[PDB]
Amino acid sequence: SHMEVRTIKVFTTVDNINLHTQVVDMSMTYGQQFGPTYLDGADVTKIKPHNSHEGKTFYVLPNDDTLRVEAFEYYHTTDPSFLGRYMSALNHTKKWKYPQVNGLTSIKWADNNCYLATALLTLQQIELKFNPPALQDAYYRARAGEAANFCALILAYCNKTVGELGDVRETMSYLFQHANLDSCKRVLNVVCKTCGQQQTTLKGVEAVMYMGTLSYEQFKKGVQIPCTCGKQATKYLVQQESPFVMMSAPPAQYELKHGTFTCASEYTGNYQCGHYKHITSKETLYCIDGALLTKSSEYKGPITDVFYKENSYTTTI
Numbered sequence: 001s002h003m004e005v006r007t008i009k010v011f012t013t014v015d016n017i018n019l020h021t022q023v024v025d026m027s028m029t030y031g032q033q034f035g036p037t038y039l040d041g042a043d044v045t046k047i048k049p050h051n052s053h054e055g056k057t058f059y060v061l062p063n064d065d066t067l068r069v070e071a072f073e074y075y076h077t078t079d080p081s082f083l084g085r086y087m088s089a090l091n092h093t094k095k096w097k098y099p100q101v102n103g104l105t106s107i108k109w110a111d112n113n114c115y116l117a118t119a120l121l122t123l124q125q126i127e128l129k130f131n132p133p134a135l136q137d138a139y140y141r142a143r144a145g146e147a148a149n150f151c152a153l154i155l156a157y158c159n160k161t162v163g164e165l166g167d168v169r170e171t172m173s174y175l176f177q178h179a180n181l182d183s184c185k186r187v188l189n190v191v192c193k194t195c196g197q198q199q200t201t202l203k204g205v206e207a208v209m210y211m212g213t214l215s216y217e218q219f220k221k222g223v224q225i226p227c228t229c230g231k232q233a234t235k236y237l238v239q240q241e242s243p244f245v246m247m248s249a250p251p252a253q254y255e256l257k258h259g260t261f262t263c264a265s266e267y268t269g270n271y272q273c274g275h276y277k278h279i280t281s282k283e284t285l286y287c288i289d290g291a292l293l294t295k296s297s298e299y300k301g302p303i304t305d306v307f308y309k310e311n312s313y314t315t316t317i
């Protein structure tokens with residue numbers, strides 16, 4: 001009747017660093033013993049242990065106080081589905097290719113990941129330190145060329161699944177949310193001919209992102225925005241303290257000039273499907289399109305996001 005019990009030792013984890021010794025019954029599934037369980041991204045919840053599994057590390061969900069703390073300390077989230085979504089993505093991104101293109105880690109196109117490739121390429125050209133150890137650790141590996149965990153983390157943090165259409169501005173917003181931008185400061189002035197002037201200070205992520213124009217110069221000169229009185233008012237940059245700025249707008253034909261920006265994202269398509277490309281300004285203009293690379297002296301296209309170097313700026317207005 002009853003089969004002789006066989007067991008193996010395995011380790012469970014939520015961060016792949018702190019291991020937790022377990023003894024599993026090879027006649028029960030992982031799911032029956034751990035809840036949802038993953039082996040390097042693969043869902044083994046419904047798998048019964050193999051001898052080859054002995055000594056291997058499995059991710060589980062934070063189901064006790066020790067794992068909850070380890071997971072928060074490593075990822076800076078308490079979203080219950082986070083680890084599941086991170087493993088589900090990782091099962092895909094570990095099969096993506098990450099070619100070095102013009103010295104930067106890119107991503108060969110798959111699974112609508114073009115927005116991720118230009119986000120990744122952008123990160124490697126701006127000064128940014130992540131706060132979660134998971135992002136620090138994974139970004140370091142991504143810079144070295146092994147970007148699978150980093151890309152799966154971006155998907156998890158953004159609540160995007162592999163293959164879902166993503167927006168670069170929104171993705172960067174999530175990444176900046178988890179970065180140290182505390183010393184970034186922006187002072188704006190808005191001037192209405194009827195209502196007068198109103199100055200506003202922004203900090204952190206809101207200090208480095210602007211939605212409305214791609215041109216940093218235009219933002220220094222002034223952009224027209226609605227005023228509550230019904231007139232159009234003029235908003236201009238008074239003071240900026242940050243290592244970069246990101247200027248974003250709905251996709252519009254726009255000319256990129258060598259040496260006047262750091263990098264940019266281009267979006268061809270519509271609200272339901274499209275394709276992002278990346279433009280970086282080095283010795284010439286390089287267009288990185290996943291694994292593909294072209295160059296040109298001028299660039300014009302439907303640009304959505306442009307990144308600029310900064311340190312300290314003060315208006316003369």
Ligand SMILES: [Zn+2]
Pocket residue numbers: 192193194195196227228229230231233
């Ligand atoms: Zn007004």
